[PDB]
Design a protein around this ligand. Structure first.
Ligand code: HEM
Ligand SMILES: CCSc1ccc(C(=O)O)cc1
Ligand SMILES: [Cl-]
Length: 393
């Protein structure tokens, strides 16, 4: 009943151009079996959305990577939020929700926007830049570690730790095993910065620790929740802003629309999250036998969701393969959906908005003027290098 496919969604060929293989996955049926890794796959919007929105049947506490925590030892202590189910999930979720709240956004917005304008002005002096190292990486690196309250020393470890995290959701291929081999110093740095004494007053980290007396979390939970923000909050935004710039460079008509109405900046970023989905895939584990898209999946089975594919499903989206900054994007699953829907989305959107705003006001053209290089990762999609020429408005 369920079709069996030999496509490896964690192969370099697949990362290099996933879209044909994703259509193959979608069109094979609502539920496929991937023989390469012995997991179920869902690549259509309807099923991805369904799975995300049934956390009881499709749980996160057995890991959202290939590895099933009931069978194997997690490579690091489980995340208290990503890798928990309700009810254990609920109160740590509420804390991060309050730390990364509207009111917090209001306190950091002017500083994030100043840094974005400053960076763009700086890049315009150089003219010819690498939009990944010099922009997509540089800008979040200039605001997010400070917003966390991290010391200056050791920040070089943040992006490698994050790449390690996203590679570790994948299967035990060479990307994963190589990241884990080199992980020790990145883990040591991160875990040490998660302790209260190391997090500057006023920051997200110190705020998490200050929530440890409300009865929502205990002091011994706070360092792992800081760990969550250091895992999830930098590299994703780097790839999201990277996606946006790449899109504006490939769709000059849309840069021109953005320039003419900079208030389109927030939706232009959202549409880039749909179009390139920085977080491409991750898993759930079935807690019982279940019927999904007319197919029967047994208990204790891993289910691979293709978020990027869901976001390009022509069953859901008109002209899914176009970047349209005035698209009604609501419903996209680039930030997930349901109880685990990205708790950091206000931070991401704020970074993305104020950067695209800066570009909209200061830049007349973005032309690729060098070889584009992709960065390969088991679950993150994004570029290694994007040489562009920026023309000042
Ligand atoms: C464009 C940028 C981002 C993207 C595409 C993204 C994507 C996602 C997705 C797809 C999920 C759902 C995972 C699941 O359902 O298992 C998620 C959850 C989460 N994200 Fe984000 N994220 C981004 C930015 C951020 C930022 C900036 C932070 C922190 C400041 C953050 C922290 C988290 C955390 C802690 C979770 C776990 C939430 C939960 O399990 O309730 N993310 N993210
Ligand atoms: C899979 C969505 S991105 C993400 C990575 C790490 C964590 C965490 O460490 O809790 C949360 C979300
Ligand atoms: Cl760790």
């Amino acid at each position: 009943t369920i079709p069996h496919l030999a496509i490896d969604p964690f192969s370099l060929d697949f990362f290099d151009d996933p879209y044909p293989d994703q259509q193959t996955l979608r069109d094979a049926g609502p539920v496929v079996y991937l023989d390469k890794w012995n997991v179920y796959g869902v690549a259509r919007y309807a099923e991805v959305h369904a799975v995300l929105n049934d956390p009881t049947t499709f749980c996160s506490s057995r890991g959202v990577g290939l590895s099933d925590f009931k069978k194997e030892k997690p490579w690091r202590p489980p995340s208290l939020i990503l890798e928990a189910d309700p009810p254990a999930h609920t109160r740590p979720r509420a804390v991060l929700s309050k730390v990364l709240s509207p009111a917090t956004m209001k306190t950091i917005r002017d500083g994030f926007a100043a840094a974005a304008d400053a960076k763009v002005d700086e890049l315009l002096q150089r003219g010819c830049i690498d939009a990944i190292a010099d922009l997509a990486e540089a800008y979040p690196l200039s605001v997010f570690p400070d917003a966390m309250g991290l010391k200056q020393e050791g920040r070089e470890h943040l992006l490698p730790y994050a790449g390690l995290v996203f590679n570790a959701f994948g299967p035990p291929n060479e990307l994963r095993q190589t990241a884990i081999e080199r992980s020790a110093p990145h883990q040591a740095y991160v875990n040490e910065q998660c302790q209260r004494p190391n997090l500057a007053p006023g920051g997200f980290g110190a705020c998490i620790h200050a929530f440890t007396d409300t009865g929502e979390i205990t002091p011994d939970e706070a360092p792992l929740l800081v760990r969550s923000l250091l895992s999830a909050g930098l590299d994703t935004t780097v790839n999201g802003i990277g996606a946006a710039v790449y899109c504006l460079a490939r769709f000059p008509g849309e840069l021109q629309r953005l320039r003419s109405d900079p208030t389109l900046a927030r939706n232009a970023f959202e549409e880039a999250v749909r179009f390139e989905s920085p977080v491409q895939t991750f898993f759930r584990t079935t807690t019982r036998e279940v019927e999904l898209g007319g197919a029967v999946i047994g208990e204790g089975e891993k289910v691979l969701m293709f978020l990027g594919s869901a976001n390009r499903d022509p069953r859901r989206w008109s002209d899914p393969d176009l970047y349209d900054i005035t698209r009604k994007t609501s419903g996209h699953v680039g930030f997930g959906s349901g109880v685990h829907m990205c708790v950091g989305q206000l931070v991401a959107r704020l970074e993305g908005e104020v950067m695209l705003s800066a570009l909209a006001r200061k830049v007349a053209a973005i032309d690729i003027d060098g070889p584009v290089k992709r960065r390969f990762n088991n679950t993150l999609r994004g570029l290694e290098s994007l040489p562009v020429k920026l023309t000042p408005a």
